[PDB]
Structures are given as structure tokens and as C-alpha cells.
Design a protein around this ligand. Structure first.
Ligand SMILES: [Mg+2]
Ligand SMILES: [Mg+2]
Ligand SMILES: [Mg+2]
Ligand SMILES: [Mg+2]
Ligand SMILES: [Mg+2]
Ligand SMILES: [Mg+2]
Ligand SMILES: [Mg+2]
Ligand SMILES: [Mg+2]
Ligand SMILES: [Mg+2]
Ligand SMILES: [Mg+2]
Ligand SMILES: [Mg+2]
Ligand SMILES: [Mg+2]
Ligand SMILES: [Mg+2]
Ligand SMILES: [Mg+2]
Ligand SMILES: [Mg+2]
Ligand SMILES: [Mg+2]
Ligand SMILES: [Mg+2]
Ligand SMILES: [Mg+2]
Ligand SMILES: [Mg+2]
Ligand SMILES: [Mg+2]
Ligand SMILES: [Mg+2]
Ligand SMILES: [Mg+2]
Ligand SMILES: [Mg+2]
Ligand SMILES: [Mg+2]
Ligand SMILES: [Mg+2]
Ligand SMILES: [Mg+2]
Ligand SMILES: [Mg+2]
Ligand SMILES: [Mg+2]
Ligand SMILES: [Mg+2]
Ligand SMILES: [Mg+2]
Lengths: 206, 50, 125, 119, 145, 135
RNA sequence: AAACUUUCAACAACGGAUCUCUUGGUUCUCGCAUCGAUGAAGAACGCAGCGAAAUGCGAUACGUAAUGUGAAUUGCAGAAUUCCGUGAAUCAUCGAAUCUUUGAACGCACAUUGCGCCCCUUGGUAUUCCAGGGGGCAUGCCUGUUUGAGCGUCAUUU
RNA sequence: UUGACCUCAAAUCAGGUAGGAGUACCCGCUGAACUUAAGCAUAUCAAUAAGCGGAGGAAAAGAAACCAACCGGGAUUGCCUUAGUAACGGCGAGUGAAGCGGCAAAAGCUCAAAUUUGAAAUCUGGUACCUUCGGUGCCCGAGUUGUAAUUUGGAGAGGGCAACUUUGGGGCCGUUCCUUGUCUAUGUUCCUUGGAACAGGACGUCAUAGAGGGUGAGAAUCCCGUGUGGCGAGGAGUGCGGUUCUUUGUAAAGUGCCUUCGAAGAGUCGAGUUGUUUGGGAAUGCAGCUCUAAGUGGGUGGUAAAUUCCAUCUAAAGCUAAAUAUUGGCGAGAGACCGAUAGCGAACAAGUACAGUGAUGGAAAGAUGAAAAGAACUUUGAAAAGAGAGUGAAAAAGUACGUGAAAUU
RNA sequence: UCUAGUGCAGAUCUUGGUGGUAGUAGCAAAUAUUCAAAUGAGAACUUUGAAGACUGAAGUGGGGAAAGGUUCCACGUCAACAGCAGUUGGACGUGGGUUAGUCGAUCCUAAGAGAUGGGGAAGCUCCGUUUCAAAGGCCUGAUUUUAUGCAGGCCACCAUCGAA
């Protein structure tokens, strides 16, 4: 709120063969006589300063949220939409891909990864490992340095170690059936994420 | 003025001790950005106003 | 990933902490790994480096060269080894500044405090 | 190099005063050489040794004053605690824990009880 | 300034309102703080239920008198009838209100039964010894809706 | 009354603010007595005051003060609340009986502007409250 | 026809845009409550082996003590006992100290490095003069002590 | 004459205390105008800025002389709402609350007014001792013009009868909190490019660690760290969890029935007038002046007045955490923010240099290279420099140093 | 797909930079310079000598107050400055240099400023300066536990600042 206004500038008016923009007073510096307070002026005030009471968050109706989440879940059981996201499920026999509830009790990232390899997510993990690149613009030095794809979303009913086992695997996300975030299910507003369901979750979905 | 106060003489002595260029070993130091002495005063160019 | 709220992943803060570190933390930042022989013989992977350690260069244009440490120039985050030098046009020898991450310790300078550090880190002597 | 304080704390007051005057003599003899020679960093150690000796003397005197004023109120205002002005003006934990006989009796008769709600 | 067919708007922004705009970014963090504070208080009163037993009471204002509501305190007559004193009740988790009066026997006896249920449902540890661990709950209001 | 301290009655403004003589000083004479006594004796705390006499030129009050440093008051739980530092210059903030009177601080519909603090209520109900999810 | 003017290109200049960097800012959130007559904030003057600043410090002066780590600092010089150790270091921590002249600033003054009074001590053949050293002398208010004032006033005196 | 009392004084008397800074937030006083009204005077801006006094970690407020008119609620604060509503307003412009309801947070209390009167039972100070945030003994003193116990209206007290029930403070070891230290995985294996591998490819490992940073180019696996747990150190502490010593206490508190009582705040309430203020409207609060009460009384009950009722509280004395605020300070973490004409004025020896008598005003200015390896030496020249040579991956990087636009030459 | 500090020829626009004008206007007040030698890479301007001139004692002289602050003096020395030049310099770099019982300040009072007491003022602060105040210190000793009270007597301006 202070910016562009920590000066005592007043216009010289007409008669001095300069423009009527307000000027810094005094002398002996270099800033003396320079334009001030203007958006066109070096060291001035930007047009329409940005305020914190901008609207940042948006209300969405609860039922629209749920409509969208249901649609994004239904799009998971469509191989045409999952391929169109680039999820590498050509060799996957059929989807919805359901695995046993034994996966929820895995404690080690090694075992968790091997289970996904066996089930068929090997290429969807290698995609993420190969896709790490530097972000282009000024996000690099705004703590947004690395970009990459996402891999599968593993959906469980109860967590007995699987979320920590898959916490460090790049791209792999975990979710409970109760929550099922749309931001995970349809990233970039594109439908058809590769979702690996447990049988308990697939049953609790009803 | 010749008949002067000790205070004015003291500040003048500080200014005489400040009226120095840089030492040049300060320019050889690791991560040094001082090239010259920017606070240099001369009796002809700028008055102390004390 | 990080889980604590006392830890920061800010590049700016980390870089400031690196470049404005005191000499007592630049010591730990300037650690070097041990050779296979010594990591087997002591049980230690890496250690802070000091002046009378014997060392082997494993990266760079001075790859393969051995020597004895001469200075731990913590200000520059660097290490001056003897027998690793640049010969100037004016018949002078100027030490080349190395980073200890690109080194391998071959003979440690031992004393009560390094021995205590090793037994602390889980060593066998 | 210089002197070490742990080998000075074993000395007496007079030994320390003699040490101090000797060190000041050395410092003068070094200041007359500093103007002949181009550089003389030996003077730093003598300065710091003078400082160490004076610190030890101050400690020895202050501890004796502390023992003189031991266990009696109204000790001096450089041996007291400095904590802060407000914390020095604050009520003690005695004066702040004082209560009336009316409130003591009610605290004893009807204290906050420890109750749980299952059965 | 007055123009085509539009409602007359009364927007009160002719003072320096931009100096006084509170945007509640703190909503989430302040919820987290409230939850942490409730947790700390519960741990500090580790057996106790974090809320006093409040009475059932009838709302004023003929718009609202069709609804019964939670009140402040248990109306010294009510606790005397429940068979205990106000001072002891305050140490036992019973809110007492000295300034409300009983004019309605239904509310009175309902609150007395509330107190009897509370006294039968709580265990009060002696001031001496054991502290027989007792599995706190965090709401007396949920136990006596 | 309080004559407006303005040279020769010129206020340099609008006629509604041209008054000089008939103005009244929202604080009481009891209050400005407590002030002067507390400034003369800053090591003490004002407790209360009371009218004792008056004439045409002067009103006369007696101020009770209490030394929060004396041990008879540092102890004596009934009066050691005055020794907390939130009671420094009570009269200057209006925490005495006359101070609260003049601040207008009483319960009820007659004190809606001055119940929790006039400026506090003004700042409250001239504040735009905006939420993340705008209501 | 040359020179000159103009236009374009290559190279060289003038200049410092663009691009890419960032130990900085801005905003949001969280937690905490800690200045000062026990002399604060601020100011002036000084302090380093070689510094004018900045930073740090105060005649114990880029610092002393204590504790921890455990061998540096670095631009050069110099130093070495400080290296299997009560111990390096422009290290970190920090609980003991020092803290010039000042400043709410407190003996009186201050456009003065001015002018005093008291205590103890030293010296000059000195209760008195001169000097040195150390320690003190503000105002308002409270509690109390001592000394007092007032036909304000009581008693008791012969 | 002597010795008191009262009131007032002096002391470099014994001990203390206040001042100033900061001031984002807080409590108050004081107090505009620009502006809007398409002019302007009430109004609005605004009970705002500026000015003054005064605090803390929050402050303030606060246990109803409340809201109500209901089958009544029940300290205070804050949020959602009530509501742009009732109301004010050249009834124009404009302004504009509150009760209820839902929630966060919850906590209650204490003096005065009573004969201890079979015992000033109370307290500061000094001094000796001690286990010293204090205790005991002694001695002056304060104090009966009232210090303790007892009670605070919800009650309660004095007698009388009748039985029961419940209690205090220290130590030790833990836990809680604060601060801090330390330990706790996996490649630097092979080929190509390159000055440098942190690039590309091959083979692997760890992963509750693939956050981030550094290192001669994009590094989980080279370093610090990260993650997960462990082992310590120093404090504060009465929050509780166990153990141990003192037995407080011929004491205190609570409960039932009868009876006699039941003190409750004055130049205040209230009224008139003036001024200011409020949405407050025959007067919302505040202040000044004048008048000035009562005790089955008094206040309130949003239209002034008389009469009769009803309801609801109990002023003129006082304390009290939490929820709440916080552009300041200290310490942390983040961002669809800015990226050196931007972003704080200030990324640098910035409130600096400099200007002004002064109050005040107030800049510009970042980037060699991985590493100075910052050009030894020859030669022309008075020298600066040049030409060679040389360093470097590159001098189309030479301290006028990354890239090096345009104008202009 | 989202988002906005999103598109420049103008605003006597802001900041920075660059031209033509142009090697142009001009560098002309204060009478005036010349010869040789030395120095030096280099001399219209430095130094010395010789000559010719001026200020002409109400001076272009010798000293001071204010102000300046090291400009004083020496040595070295020319990238910038000295609107030509420069070997010179009030420039640059490195150092040296200001000695008081008698000179001033210090002290006095002047016009005047300004505490205390008191009184105003919401208050920052205002009045007022001997006032409606219980507003102090000066000589001599007496005692010789002994240091300095009591023994005496005296005296009543009532801060302080204010002149190189
Ligand atoms: Mg023109
Ligand atoms: Mg008046
Ligand atoms: Mg005005
Ligand atoms: Mg108008
Ligand atoms: Mg108009
Ligand atoms: Mg007009
Ligand atoms: Mg203000
Ligand atoms: Mg408070
Ligand atoms: Mg209060
Ligand atoms: Mg509506
Ligand atoms: Mg208004
Ligand atoms: Mg009126
Ligand atoms: Mg007003
Ligand atoms: Mg009115
Ligand atoms: Mg290149
Ligand atoms: Mg280049
Ligand atoms: Mg370049
Ligand atoms: Mg061009
Ligand atoms: Mg724009
Ligand atoms: Mg343009
Ligand atoms: Mg256009
Ligand atoms: Mg232009
Ligand atoms: Mg010409
Ligand atoms: Mg001319
Ligand atoms: Mg000269
Ligand atoms: Mg020239
Ligand atoms: Mg020249
Ligand atoms: Mg005056
Ligand atoms: Mg004088
Ligand atoms: Mg004179």
C-alpha cells in the first residue's frame, strides 16, 4: 500500500516547458525533478494496485462437485479415455483394474513397486521417471523447479502401510474411497486417470 | 575559524582521518565488491556543514 | 519428501544458509567420502575433512592424482592439496582449489577426537 | 599465546597486580618498537593478556563482595539480578499466591474434582 | 449518475473502508488452532469431558418458543432437588445459573432427570488415591442430547 | 466549560464548528482531578475519588491512592490486583468509576454505542468482513 | 568521373536493451511476548600488525571470561606450542565482566571537553592552599527514622 | 516546668518508586478540511486524519439497576445472521444499530454498610538466627477517626434442636512444556560427448528417505541434508503419575427444621437548561451550570403528561482467564506475487552519497571465468598503450569484463 | 485447458541514452609582455637571470574577525581538474606541522533568555523571575573521649545563561 507514494511530489504546473506530471522536489540528488506517483513514471505506483481482497477461492455447489467426481470415476473404466491421457495401458488386460486387498498391508516401497510392476504399471512408472524436466519460466526459482507426469492412483479402503510405501514413488498417488479428489481423478480437467483399485475399495464404492 | 571549539576540532580530526583512499589489499580479498572509496570528501567540492 | 514444519524447501533460504554459513558448519558441509578400504576398515561412509588427511581425486581434470591436504579453505568451500597445482607463466606454483565431495580419503589423520567421532558414528577402529 | 585464566585463578591479588604491571611495561616496550618495525602482531597477545588478568581480578573482588553480602537483604545493584525492569517490579510468587482466609477455606472445601463420564 | 431502469443501490463505501477490510485467510489455520487447543485442554483435564452439563430450557420470543434449547445453568432449585449443592456441582461438571428461576414444572423436572442421569453416568474419583482410569469422552452434550 | 483553545475565535472551517465558548469537555472535573494527582504522584495508583466541597470557581475532590510498592499492599490479596501493570494510570484511560461513567460503559439498550468501547464498536461495524468463499 | 548526401549489408564503435540468472523484496499463515534510573532507544569520539566504509566493540575497545565443537584464519605478513589437547578458529553458544563522552540524563551548567561542594586516601614542612586517586551530591511521590515549628492544642507543674 | 497529641516542615536521613523509547493492535481526550450533495450553509467526509495523554502481550469489557413480553431467556467478547432492515436525514445526498436464533469460547466472584469487646485477635519496618522469591524471636512503629476473622443479596447473620459427611503441606523419581546436541540407507561401476559429467546409453542399489541445497552442465544413490526412530544435556513447572516424611486438627467447611433479624454505595439517581454526540425520533449517551431525592424505595419497559396496575432488575464501590485484534518486535513456514526502469526508497559500504539555515528531501549502482589460470617474456614507444607470445573450452570472456539490440557513428 | 501487473507512435508522457545544430557560437573587461639558459620525451605558460611594466600606502602590500577546515610545509608526481597548455598547482599520492600562569575563551553583567516556588492548561506545555515560599552560609573559636556538634555572634542578595 505504501509503494510509489513514499515521496512528497508536487506538480510544477505549466510555464516550465515540462509535463504536468508531479515531480520530486528539492535538489542535489538526481531524483530531484523526476516524475512521481504515476503509473507511467519510473519509481511510481502501478495502475490499480493488487489487493488481497481479490476473490481467490470459488464456491462450487456440492452436487456439481459430486457430479464431476462421479464422472471422473466413470471415465476411469474407459480404456479410450485412459490412453488419451497418456497412461500406457495398452498391455493392461482390462480395466477397471482391481487387485487384492493384500496391497493395503504392504509396508515397503520395494514390495509396493514390485506389485505394481506385476500388475502392469511398469510403463506408467517409467514414464514418470523419464519425464522429469526443468520447468521453463520463472517458476524454477519459485519452488516449482521440476515437472513430471503422474502415474497411477492407488485407491484403498483402509491404510495399513500402503500410503507410506508409495509416498516416495514418483507419480504414484494414493487415495481413500471416501475422499476421491477430483484433482487427482481428472488432472488438468482431462478425464481418464489410470486407477488401481483394491477389492475392498471397489466394493465400498457402492 | 582559528578560535574554535574542541567539538569542531574533534569532528575536523575525524574528517582528516577519513580523507583517505582505499587500501589496496581490500581489493584482493575473497568476495570483494569495493572498488573505490565513495565517501571521499574534498574541501573544494563539498562542505561538511558541522 | 519432507514432513516436518520446521524444515524448509525454499531454494532462497537454503542458498542463503549455504553462503552465509559459519566456519563451524562449513566444516560439516566440507565432508569427503572414504575409500572402499577405509569404509570397510572403520565402518564409516564419510567424514569432515581436515588438514593432514591423505586424499585421492576422483573427478575433474586432476582425476587419479593423490596428495596430502594442505589447506581447508572454508571461506571458498575448497581444499588445497599439495602435489595438485597450476604452474603459472612466471615460474610460480598456485594451489588448485578442490571440493571434498570430489575426493576420496585414503589415510586419516587420527587423534582422540576423530576416534571419538568414529566410535560415535558407529565405527570399529 | 598469552596467559590462561585457569592458571591465574589459582594466584592471589598481589601476584596478579605484579603480573599486570609487568604486562603493561611489555606493552609499552612493544609500542616503542612498533614505530621502528614495519609490523608487530605480538602486541595483540599482550593486550589480551592484560584483559584476561583484569577480568580475573574483577571476578575475585566481586565474589568476595558477594560472600560479604551473603544471606542478607539489600545487596548491591551490580550483584543483584538484571532480569528486566518489569520482571523486577512484578509480584513475587509469594505475593501472587497470597489469598484470603475466605478463599483458602473454599479452595479446601470445594476443589475442582476429577470426574469421568462412563458409568 | 442515475441511469437506465435499475434498482436503487445503497452501497456504503463513502468512508475509507479499504483501511478496514478483514479477509479471513486465517479460516483453516484458525480451525487447526482450535482443534489443537481443544486437544491440549482435553489432555490437561484428561478424564474430564471438556464441557459442562448444561440444562434444557425453553427459548423466548414467540417465534422460537416452539423449540427447546440448551441453556447456561441448572437453576439452584433444580440442583437442590437433584440432591447436591451448587458449589459441589460446579466442581463436578454442572453449570449453575443463579439468576434464572423455575416457573415451569415440565422444564424443572426434565432438568432434574438430566441431573440424575448425569450423576448416575459419571464416576467421581476420590481426593485421596487411586485415580481408576476411566476413558474420558469429549462431550457431555453428545451423551445427554 | 472548556473554551476552545483557538486564537481569537477563528476556527477556519464551517459554521457548525465555529463554537468557542459553550463547549463542555466530555471528561469530568473529577477525572481531570485524578489526572493531575496521578501525575504529581506517579509512583502511586489512583483507586477512587469523591466530592468534598465546591464553590463558584473551584470544585474540591479527595482522591484515594495506593502505593503498589508497599509490602502491606504487595501482600494482602484483596488489594494486590492494583500492583499488576495493567493498572498503571487507570484514570488516564478511564477505568475509574467516573472514567467508565464518562466513557458511557454500562449495560443496556441505552449504551449500544458505548458498551464494549465506542471506537471498538465503530471499527467493528465499519469493517468489511470478506471470507475465502464469499457469502 | 570524384568528393558529399542517402539506402543496405559485413566488420569495428557508441550504448546498455533483450535473454538467462538472484544471499533481495512483497503478500499469506503459524508461534512467542522480551526495552529503560540495575541507566534504555538514539548520538558523538575512538578501537585492528597493515581499514576509509559496512559490521562488531568501548581505554579489558573487530573484543576479555565461561561453555561447546575440535585444528584453523587467510588479501599479505606473522605466529607456532595451539595439535592423541583444559585447545586453533572474523567458529558457535553465552549464564560472568568491561561498557569512553553522552543521552529520560540525575551536583550546577553546556555554542564551554566550563564551574563547584562533601567523604576516604597519597604527595607537596598543610583541618584551611595546590594537585593526584577512589567514592558521592537531581526532581516529584510513598513508607518509616531523626530533628524540629506553630497560645492549633491537652494535661501537669509551683 | 516536663511530657504528649494535631497539623505542617527539613534532612546527600533508611529503603524504594515515576519519568524516556517503541507505539502494528489497545484505552481515552482533542479534532479538521479536501471531498459528496452535480452550486452551498445543516448534513456528508468523520464521531476519520493530524495533535495529546496512557498500557499489555493482548488490551478493553465482564458476572445485569440486561434482554424481554415468550411455555420466557440469563456475565463479557467474537463470527454467521438479523439488515442495508427499524430509525435518522435541506426525509435530499446520504447515514443506520439492537433483541431473538446458530456457533467459537466459557468461570466465576469481593468490598462498604454488623460489638472481637472475656481481651488489635491485624500489619510495615529494624535487628539476631535460619532451611532465604521467605520463616521464627525480640524491638520501635502504624492503627480504635477501625487493622484481622465473620457476610455480599444467588444471599446471609444471631440464638435453639438433631445427626452425619470431607480436609494440609513438603521431598524424591517420572510424565508435560521450553531450548539444545548427537547417531541413525543405497554407485561415484562401464562406454560416448565435453574443458568439467551432474548429459546420453548399459548394468544395479536404497526408498516411512525421488523435499531442498551444494559440487567445474538436468545428481534420490558424491556431500550436507530429507525420512524413520533412538540416545543424551540443561532449565521452567505444580498440570498429573507414582513413592516417602510430616499429621495438620480438642481447628475449618458443608447439609436439615424452628424462631428473631436481614445493615445493601448522595452534590449521587433524577430533573431543567446549554453544548456535543447517537439510528435514537417531545431529547441515545456524555459533559457544564442550576435544582436536588427516596426506602413496600429506585432504575428500565424506544411518543411527551396525570392516574391505576404488571413485569424485570438492584445503580451511584470493586477483581477476573478463553474465544477476539495485531502494516511494530523476535522466531518459523509458504506463494498461479515482482524479477534490478520491476519488487520496500534501498538485491551492492541505503536512509548511504548528495541538497537544503532548518523542518525535511533523497538517488544511482547486481552478473569475467569452473578456476585468476587477471596476460611471464620479446619488440616499437617518454609513457599510456600497441604488436607478438602466452593462459583459458572460449580473450567474438582482458577487472571500460555474460549475452551485447536500437538510435547514432 | 486456467490465469492476468498481457500487445504502444504519440500523452509539452517517465527514466536512460543518442544525434543534427557544429569543430559552429564562442574561450575579447581588469594597460604587457620579451630574450636567454636550466629542467624535461615534450615548454607561449615551470624555475632562474636579464629587461620592460603595473598595483602606487582609502595598495594587486602586511595583519586579522566571521566563514572554511588542513587549503599550511615538504617529498614524489600528472590518468582526471585547472573551459589553450602544463614538467606547475589551493589537483593526485605519502607524510610532517598549531608548545602560553601573562594572548583570548573561561568570569561579569547588557538588551534579553530561562528554572525553582506557586498558578493556569485535557495536555504537548504556558505565565512569571522576587514573585501570596518555613527559599541560606560567613567569621571566630570551644573542646581537647574527638572529631567537629554544641557554646556564641553576623548576615538576608534569593537560581542560572547571555559579549573570542
Ligand atoms: Mg521550447
Ligand atoms: Mg474551562
Ligand atoms: Mg479548522
Ligand atoms: Mg459540492
Ligand atoms: Mg462538482
Ligand atoms: Mg465549491
Ligand atoms: Mg491519530
Ligand atoms: Mg484486562
Ligand atoms: Mg475491569
Ligand atoms: Mg434480505
Ligand atoms: Mg455517521
Ligand atoms: Mg441539547
Ligand atoms: Mg467533539
Ligand atoms: Mg442530547
Ligand atoms: Mg563463447
Ligand atoms: Mg563471452
Ligand atoms: Mg561484453
Ligand atoms: Mg546501428
Ligand atoms: Mg499494463
Ligand atoms: Mg516508444
Ligand atoms: Mg495512438
Ligand atoms: Mg518527449
Ligand atoms: Mg570560431
Ligand atoms: Mg564575448
Ligand atoms: Mg602550497
Ligand atoms: Mg585545460
Ligand atoms: Mg592536459
Ligand atoms: Mg518560562
Ligand atoms: Mg556567564
Ligand atoms: Mg569578552
Amino acid at each position: 500500500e505504501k509503494a510509489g507514494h513514499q515521496t512528497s511530489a508536487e506538480s510544477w504546473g505549466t510555464g516550465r516547458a515540462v509535463a504536468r506530471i508531479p515531480r520530486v522536489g528539492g535538489g542535489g540528488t538526481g531524483r530531484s525533478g523526476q516524475g512521481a506517483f504515476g503509473n507511467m513514471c519510473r519509481g511510481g505506483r502501478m495502475f490499480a494496485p493488487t489487493k488481497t481482497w481479490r476473490k481467490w477461492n470459488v464456491k462450487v455447489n456440492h452436487n456439481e462437485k459430486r457430479y464431476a467426481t462421479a464422472s471422473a470415476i466413470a471415465a476411469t473404466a474407459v480404456a479410450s479415455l485412459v490412453l488419451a491421457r497418456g497412461h500406457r495401458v495398452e498391455k493392461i488386460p482390462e480395466i477397471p483394474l482391481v487387485v487384492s486387498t493384500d496391497l493395503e498391508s504392504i509396508q515397503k516401497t520395494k514390495e509396493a513397486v514390485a506389485a505394481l510392476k506385476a500388475v502392469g504399471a511398469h510403463s506408467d512408472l517409467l514414464k514418470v521417471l523419464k519425464s522429469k524436466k526443468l520447468r521453463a519460466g520463472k517458476g524454477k526459482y519459485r519452488n516449482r523447479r521440476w515437472t513430471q507426469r503422474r502415474g497411477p492412483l492407488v485407491v484403498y479402503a483402509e491404510d495399513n502401510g500402503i500410503v507410506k510405501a508409495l509416498r516416495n514413488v514418483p507419480g504414484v498417488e494414493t487415495a481413500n474411497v471416501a475422499s476421491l479428489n477430483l484433482l487427482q481423478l481428472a488432472p488438468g480437467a482431462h478425464l481418464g486417470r489410470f486407477v488401481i483399485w483394491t477389492e475392498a475399495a471397489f466394493t465400498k464404492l457402492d | 575559524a582559528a578560535q574554535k571549539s574542541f567539538r569542531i576540532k574533534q569532528k575536523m580530526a575525524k574528517a582528516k582521518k577519513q580523507n583517505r583512499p582505499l587500501p589496496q589489499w581490500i581489493r584482493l580479498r575473497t568476495n570483494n565488491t569495493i572498488r573505490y572509496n565513495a565517501k571521499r570528501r574534498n574541501w573544494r567540492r563539498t562542505k561538511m556543514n558541522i | 519428501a519432507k514432513q516436518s514444519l520446521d524444515v524448509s524447501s525454499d531454494r532462497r533460504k537454503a542458498r542463503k544458509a549455504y553462503f552465509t554459513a559459519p566456519s563451524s558448519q562449513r566444516r560439516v558441509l566440507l565432508s569427503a567420502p572414504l575409500s572402499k578400504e577405509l569404509r570397510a576398515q572403520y565402518g564409516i561412509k564419510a567424514l569432515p575433512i581436515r588438514r593432514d588427511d591423505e586424499v585421492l581425486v576422483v573427478r575433474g581434470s586432476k582425476k587419479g592424482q593423490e596428495g596430502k591436504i594442505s589447506s581447508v579453505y572454508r571461506l571458498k568451500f575448497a581444499v588445497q592439496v599439495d602435489k595438485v597445482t597450476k604452474e603459472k607463466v612466471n615460474g610460480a606454483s598456485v594451489p588448485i582449489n578442490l571440493h571434498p565431495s570430489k575426493l576420496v580419503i585414503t589415510k586419516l589423520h587420527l587423534d582422540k577426537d576423530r576416534k571419538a567421532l568414529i566410535q560415535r558414528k558407529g565405527g570399529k577402529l | 599465546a598469552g596467559v590462561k585464566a585457569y592458571e591465574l585463578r589459582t594466584k592471589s591479588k598481589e601476584q596478579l597486580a605484579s603480573q599486570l604491571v609487568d604486562l603493561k611495561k611489555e606493552l609499552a616496550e612493544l609500542k616503542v618498537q612498533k614505530l621502528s618495525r614495519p609490523s608487530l602482531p605480538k602486541i595483540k597477545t599482550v593486550r589480551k593478556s592484560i584483559a584476561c588478568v583484569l577480568t580475573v581480578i574483577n571476578e575475585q573482588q566481586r565474589e568476595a563482595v558477594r560472600q560479604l553480602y551473603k544471606g542478607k537483604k539489600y545487596q548491591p545493584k551490580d550483584l543483584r539480578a538484571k532480569k528486566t525492569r518489569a520482571l523486577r517490579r512484578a509480584l513475587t510468587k509469594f505475593e501472587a499466591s497470597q489469598v484470603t482466609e475466605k478463599q483458602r477455606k473454599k479452595q479446601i472445601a470445594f476443589p475442582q474434582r476429577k470426574y469421568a463420564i462412563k458409568a | 449518475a442515475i441511469s437506465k431502469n435499475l434498482p436503487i443501490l445503497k452501497n456504503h463505501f463513502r468512508k475509507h473502508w479499504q483501511e478496514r477490510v478483514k479477509v479471513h485467510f486465517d479460516q483453516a489455520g484458525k480451525k487447526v488452532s482450535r482443534r489443537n487447543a481443544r486437544a491440549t485442554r482435553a489432555a490437561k483435564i484428561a478424564p474430564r469431558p471438556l464441557d459442562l452439563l448444561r440444562p434444557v430450557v425453553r427459548a423466548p420470543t414467540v417465534k422460537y418458543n416452539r423449540k427447546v434449547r440448551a441453556g447456561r445453568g441448572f437453576t439452584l432449585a433444580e440442583v437442590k432437588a437433584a440432591g447436591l449443592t451448587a458449589a459441589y456441582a460446579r466442581t463436578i461438571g454442572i453449570a449453575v445459573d443463579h439468576r434464572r428461576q423455575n416457573r415451569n414444572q415440565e422444564i424443572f423436572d426434565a432438568n432434574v432427570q438430566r441431573l440424575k442421569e448425569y450423576q448416575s453416568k459419571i464416576i467421581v474419583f476420590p481426593r485421596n488415591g487411586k485415580a481408576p482410569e476411566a476413558e474420558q469422552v469429549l462431550s457431555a452434550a453428545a451423551t445427554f442430547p | 466549560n472548556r473554551k476552545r483553545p483557538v486564537p481569537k475565535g477563528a476556527t477556519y472551517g464551517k459554521p457548525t464548528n465555529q463554537g468557542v465558548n459553550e463547549l463542555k469537555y466530555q471528561r469530568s472535573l473529577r477525572a481531570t482531578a485524578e489526572e493531575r494527582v496521578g501525575r504529581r504522584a506517579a509512583n502511586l495508583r489512583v483507586l477512587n475519588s469523591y466530592w468534598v466541597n465546591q464553590d463558584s470557581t473551584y470544585k474540591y475532590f479527595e482522591v484515594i491512592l495506593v502505593d503498589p510498592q508497599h509490602k502491606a499492599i504487595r501482600r494482602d490479596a484483596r488489594y494486590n490486583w492494583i500492583c499488576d501493570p495493567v493498572h498503571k494510570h487507570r484514570e488516564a484511560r478511564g477505568l475509574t468509576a467516573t472514567g467508565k461513567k464518562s466513557r458511557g460503559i454500562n449495560k443496556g439498550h441505552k449504551f449500544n454505542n458505548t458498551k464494549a468501547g465506542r471506537r471498538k464498536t465503530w471499527k467493528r461495524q465499519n469493517t468489511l468482513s470478506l471470507w475465502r468463499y464469499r457469502k
